[PDB]
Amino acid sequence: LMGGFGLKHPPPQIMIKNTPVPANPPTNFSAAKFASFITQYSTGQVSVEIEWELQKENSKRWNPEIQYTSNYNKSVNVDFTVDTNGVYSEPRPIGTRYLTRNL
């Protein structure tokens, strides 16, 4: 009901964590659990490649259909673009429904 594709077997969950690295243990055995860990984090790269199937417009409609277009008028910032401070921004939500079909 928010939108999209209901799936019984959706793309799986990818889980990740940093393996614990203990700090120096005591020199006499104690069965208590370690609260002492080396503070660390990890970084890396992630790629996602999805293959989307398309359904083409077959319409016989004579007159021009609405399309999603960028405003021609000048502006301080360009839409869907970084600003002077490097911050990416999306000015408006874009739905997918423009082309028209008959019932």
Partner: protein
């Protein structure tokens, strides 16, 4: 080789997009009168016209077909597809037909 009671062609107006190329067809109905009583006549600018507007020529009984305008071959929607999705287009080959002639 048909005769009076057999149509010599069919009506094809459609456009089809192959995605490398587009093939646009236009079928129309026309009427040809009899121009200037079957006569070749010379025509020339009337004296008193400005120097720049003088001309001399010939008018013929013949008519002619010209599709040279774009919208002949493209509907406004087919035109929208082209100009929106494409950096360039050029014509490759054309095919022309006259059929279902009637003389009244």
């Amino acid at each position: 080789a048909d005769g009076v009671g057999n149509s010599s062609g069919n009506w094809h107006c459609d456009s089809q997009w192959l995605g490398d190329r587009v093939i646009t067809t236009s079928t129309r109905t026309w009427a040809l009168p009899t121009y200037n009583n079957h006569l070749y006549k010379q025509i020339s600018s009337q004296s008193g016209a400005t120097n720049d507007n003088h001309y001399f020529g010939y008018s013929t009984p013949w008519g002619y077909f010209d599709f040279n305008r774009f919208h002949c071959h493209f509907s406004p929607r087919d035109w929208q597809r082209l100009i929106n999705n494409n950096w360039g287009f050029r014509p490759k080959r054309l095919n022309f037909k006259l059929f279902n002639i009637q003389v009244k």
